[PDB]
Amino acid sequence: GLPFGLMRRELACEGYPIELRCPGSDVIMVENANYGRTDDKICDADPFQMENVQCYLPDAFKIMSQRCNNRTQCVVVAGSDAFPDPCPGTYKYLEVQYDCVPYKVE
Numbered sequence: 001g002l003p004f005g006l007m008r009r010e011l012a013c014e015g016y017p018i019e020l021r022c023p024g025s026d027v028i029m030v031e032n033a034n035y036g037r038t039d040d041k042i043c044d045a046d047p048f049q050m051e052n053v054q055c056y057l058p059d060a061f062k063i064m065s066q067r068c069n070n071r072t073q074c075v076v077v078a079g080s081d082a083f084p085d086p087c088p089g090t091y092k093y094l095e096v097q098y099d100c101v102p103y104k105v106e
């Protein structure tokens with residue numbers, strides 16, 4: 001298990017495509033995800049866009065959930081029309097935590 005061997009997670013800088021992939025024949029199951037900015041050390045951008053570390057967008061979860069739920073892999077633009085606009089002027093990001101489960105029982 002090269003990774004943490006438990007719960008997968010990806011993060012991407014606003015405006016770029018993000019890609020999720022589940023091992024074997026498992027499928028991605030979005031648990032939690034957000035679009036915005038809650039840290040200033042992620043996606044190194046201009047200081048002015050990195051100043052506000054308080055931006056949340058709950059609905060971002062529904063978007064990724066619908067796009068990656070029950071799928072082995074999914075690609076989405078961490079911005080553009082694919083994500084609303086909660087804090088315009090800040091360099092956001094998209095964080096998604098998910099797990100991979102069998103497409104069937106056991």
Ligand SMILES: *[C@@H]1O[C@H](CO)[C@@H](O)[C@H](O)[C@H]1NC(C)=O
Pocket residue numbers: 065066069070
């Ligand atoms: C995923 O598949 C399971 C199969 O039982 C289903 O219950 C669930 O609603 C599906 N979710 C989505 C988003 O398709």
Ligand SMILES: C[C@@H]1O[C@@H](O)[C@H](O)[C@H](O)[C@H]1O
Pocket residue numbers: 014049079085087088089090091092
């Ligand atoms: C800093 C950047 O500014 C605009 O492009 C948008 O508001 C975008 O969501 C934000 O991340």
